[PDB]
Motif scaffolding. Sequence first.
Motif, PDB file in Angstrom:
ATOM      1  N   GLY A   1      42.426  44.424  30.626  1.00 37.99           N
ATOM      2  CA  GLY A   1      41.738  45.037  31.736  1.00 37.99           C
ATOM      3  C   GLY A   1      42.694  45.727  32.682  1.00 37.99           C
ATOM      4  O   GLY A   1      43.599  46.439  32.247  1.00 37.99           O
TER       5      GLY A   1
ATOM      6  N   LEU B   1      43.108  47.707  27.794  1.00 37.62           N
ATOM      7  CA  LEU B   1      42.439  48.183  29.018  1.00 37.62           C
ATOM      8  C   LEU B   1      40.910  48.020  28.989  1.00 37.62           C
ATOM      9  O   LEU B   1      40.289  47.872  30.033  1.00 37.62           O
ATOM     10  CB  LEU B   1      42.758  49.665  29.247  1.00 37.62           C
ATOM     11  N   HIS B   2      40.310  48.080  27.797  1.00 37.55           N
ATOM     12  CA  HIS B   2      38.867  47.946  27.646  1.00 37.55           C
ATOM     13  C   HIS B   2      38.294  46.569  27.985  1.00 37.55           C
ATOM     14  O   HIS B   2      37.150  46.457  28.443  1.00 37.55           O
ATOM     15  N   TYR B   3      39.091  45.530  27.776  1.00 35.83           N
ATOM     16  CA  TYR B   3      38.647  44.143  27.915  1.00 35.83           C
ATOM     17  C   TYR B   3      38.666  43.665  29.367  1.00 35.83           C
ATOM     18  O   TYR B   3      39.235  44.314  30.235  1.00 35.83           O
ATOM     19  CB  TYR B   3      39.558  43.226  27.087  1.00 35.83           C
ATOM     20  N   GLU B   4      38.084  42.499  29.619  1.00 35.64           N
ATOM     21  CA  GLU B   4      37.994  41.984  30.986  1.00 35.64           C
ATOM     22  C   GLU B   4      39.394  41.697  31.522  1.00 35.64           C
ATOM     23  O   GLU B   4      40.329  41.466  30.749  1.00 35.64           O
ATOM     24  CB  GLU B   4      37.122  40.725  31.068  1.00 35.64           C
ATOM     25  N   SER B   5      39.525  41.712  32.843  1.00 37.68           N
ATOM     26  CA  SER B   5      40.822  41.598  33.477  1.00 37.68           C
ATOM     27  C   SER B   5      41.240  40.148  33.535  1.00 37.68           C
ATOM     28  O   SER B   5      40.921  39.430  34.467  1.00 37.68           O
ATOM     29  CB  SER B   5      40.781  42.249  34.840  1.00 37.68           C
TER      30      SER B   5
END
Lengths: 127, 116, 127, 116
Positions: free
Chosen positions: D73, D20-24
């Motif tokens: 993301g 969830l922290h990383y880019e989508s």
Amino acid sequence: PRGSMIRTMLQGKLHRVKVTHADLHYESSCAIDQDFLDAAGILENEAIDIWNVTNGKRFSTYAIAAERGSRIISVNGAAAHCASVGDIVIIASFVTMPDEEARTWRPNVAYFEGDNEMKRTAKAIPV
Amino acid sequence: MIRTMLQGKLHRVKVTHADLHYESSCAIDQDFLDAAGILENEAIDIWNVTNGKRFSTYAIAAERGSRIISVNGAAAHCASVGDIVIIASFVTMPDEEARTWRPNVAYFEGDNEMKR
Amino acid sequence: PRGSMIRTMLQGKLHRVKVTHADLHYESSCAIDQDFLDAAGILENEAIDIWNVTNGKRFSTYAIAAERGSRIISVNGAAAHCASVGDIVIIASFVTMPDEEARTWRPNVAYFEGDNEMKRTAKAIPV
Amino acid sequence: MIRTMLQGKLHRVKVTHADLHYESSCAIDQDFLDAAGILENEAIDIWNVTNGKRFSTYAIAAERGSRIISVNGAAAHCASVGDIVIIASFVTMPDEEARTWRPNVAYFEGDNEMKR
């Protein structure tokens, strides 16, 4: 004319046709009798939009050819979660073309009745 | 580099028919098609503001002057008579042209009366 | 090379930006500070995909320019049913181009923090 | 007349991360991208066979040989670790060429091991 405005047009469609097979274990695609593909001008590996009239689900996949004369409409793999045998579906492909061509374009359409019996028009089809 | 741009749209129009018997398309008064630049057999996006549903289909002509918006076939399960919908089409063109592109827009009041 | 294979590529995007206005009574579109449009290479009237990170809704609309320096992200009309003020959204545009160009293409990206303060990279952004 | 054709796909692969922290985007072992002809920054369709969800995003490369499929993301709300997904891209070309077009396909077994 370079830079001409490009339209997205209905290339062709199978009007209400019946799903004959739905198998979660074959590859995610819709396999369609080659005769039906010919009539709708749809190509193997072409992106297609499927609207399931029976349950209201709409999804996109790609076409593969089933044996000529098999009358197969097989919604397979992941797509087997969006249609079941007996469901009535509409299968369409869209193409792009410049505006002047789009203005006179006539889509390739096939209608169906009974045991996936294909007709050129809706004239003979029950209501 | 090719851009996808709004070609045209009908702002908030009212659904006058939703005929399950008819083919799965949206039939639109030809006058409205003319104003929005939308063609028969062109892909369209419909946004139903009344019930939130969004879907894609293709346009066909309804009788000129009829003020009809008919969401038919399988599409009739996405809108009922009286629902407010927005209907749009999109075209592609190179970036250079896209930078100055102007969509074709029609607005409505009362009983699908086009603001003229 | 005529008939070359055409790719659909991320042209540019606004990474997680905050919705500032959502008004069912303005036209269905997303109005975006022109500075932000410049940074993402997004054009007025261009089709855009919006992913609402807060509620998981994904939808398509088109961009319109808001006043430079307003820091507005306004999701309006029908789209006001898919996002609310304070929601975090991602706004992207896609372009097509031949394969060789696609292989070296670099999207135009903008990152945001705080009061829709725009940055060129993620380096300064809180986690 | 321009057709939209399957360019390539990864058949049933397993999601190894959903960060969830990383880019989508979806991060994919570069070896898998190479086999399917999918490019970094290319639009992709993902079909999650385990939970039925379908969505679109774009591809980015993960470390070669890592066998990673990472749905990150906002996309991480559409798939969890262990889910089976199908990942595809589509290209356009004129009808004449489309008639003989062959997509680039990769199949997997065990722990995202590409059938070679």
